[PDB]
Design a protein around this ligand. Structure first.
Ligand SMILES: [Mn+2]
Ligand SMILES: [Mn+2]
Ligand SMILES: [Mn+2]
Ligand SMILES: [Mn+2]
Lengths: 214, 215
């Protein structure tokens, strides 16, 4: 019915946790060389995310909407460890070296996933741009949950500080999903069609990225 | 750098405090219907400024650079009162209804100023976009000092919370000018030409804005 319901339904189906990458993870049938491949190829999207948000902010005249995006941007980039710093710890805890992470070149599948976000966040529909992020960010608390379990059981992650990023995202993205849902409603301009479009795009692209490794 | 020094001389040689509108301010010869013109038209630029910063951030892949742009943006928009809020108080301390300020359609002069900034901030040179901000922001601390003097000497201001915006920008924009100047060096990609070109345009566009109220 109402487009937000349909929007939440698109995610519930094309949801990353049901992609085979995470099935195998949840099961534990995933190689450490695989985990390192995923971790490094993710980095690009880890570094582009602040621009997903600021791409949207920069085209926005709704002052109350812009503050919520700031709050999101601040949670990711401001301070130390910011959300990028936290991913590097998961990279290193996997055994990839710092020079190896800086030397890694992101796949055409990594560049495609980020291009999908960037297409919507710089597109002409601010709601669709926010809907794009929601379709990724509203799945994270669950993935973060089930990811930690996999790390500690089948991957010998004994020190909690190694998966800080995930412990942190396990709650920060409950508030982000909630506030992005608000923003979509605030920035709607007869463009419900584009919100569902972005959702359809982002949930497929997510799946295409995870396809690359399997 | 030399290119930063030429950048500072362009600003030095086209400084807002030498426009007739501030040579009048300083001498007392500014009307009060003139102050409400200014205060109200300035409100487009004020609400706009964060997107100048987020425009550059969204095209930038230098992580250290982006944190300096965030710092700036946080000072500007985060919390209560933020700089937009502080501008509202001062417009109201001028005698303007929250209702007329928000019914006010900004002048063509105002739209022109904001369009100039936005051209560079959406543009292709990240250092030029920063330098466009810098060509304005480096002037603010002194204008803010002098504008506070005028409000209190010739415009009978006594409540320090009215001109809080200028109080706040007298110190905050010292840090912003400093760090923008670092950003320019950090973002340079063989575009010193573009850095100076943005500077010439913005200093002259600010002058154009200052003239709409001089009749
Ligand atoms: Mn994050
Ligand atoms: Mn988030
Ligand atoms: Mn400011
Ligand atoms: Mn500033």
């Amino acid at each position: 019915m109402n487009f937000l319901d349909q929007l939440d339904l698109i995610i519930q189906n094309k949801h990353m946790l049901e992609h085979t990458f995470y099935v195998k993870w949840s099961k534990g049938e995933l190689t450490k060389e695989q985990l390192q491949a995923y971790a490094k190829d993710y980095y690009l999207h880890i570094k582009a995310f602040p621009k997903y948000l600021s791409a949207i902010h920069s085209r926005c005249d709704d002052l109350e909407a812009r503050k919520l995006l700031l709050d999101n941007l601040m949670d990711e980039e401001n301070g130390y460890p910011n959300h990028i710093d936290l991913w590097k710890q998961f990279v290193f805890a996997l055994g990839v070296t710092p020079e190896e992470l800086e030397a890694h070149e992101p796949s055409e599948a990594a560049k495609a996933k980020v291009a999908t976000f960037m297409r919507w966040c710089t597109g002409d529909s601010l709601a669709a741009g926010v809907a794009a992020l929601y379709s990724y960010e509203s799945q994270i608390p669950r993935i973060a949950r089930e990811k930690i379990r996999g790390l500690t059981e089948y991957f010998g992650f004994s020190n909690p500080e190694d998966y800080a990023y995930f412990t942190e995202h396990e709650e920060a993205d409950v508030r982000h999903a909630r506030e992005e849902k608000a923003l979509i409603e605030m920035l709607l301009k007869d463009d419900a069609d584009k919100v569902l479009e972005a959702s359809q795009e982002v949930t497929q692209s997510l799946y295409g990225f995870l396809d690359s490794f399997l």
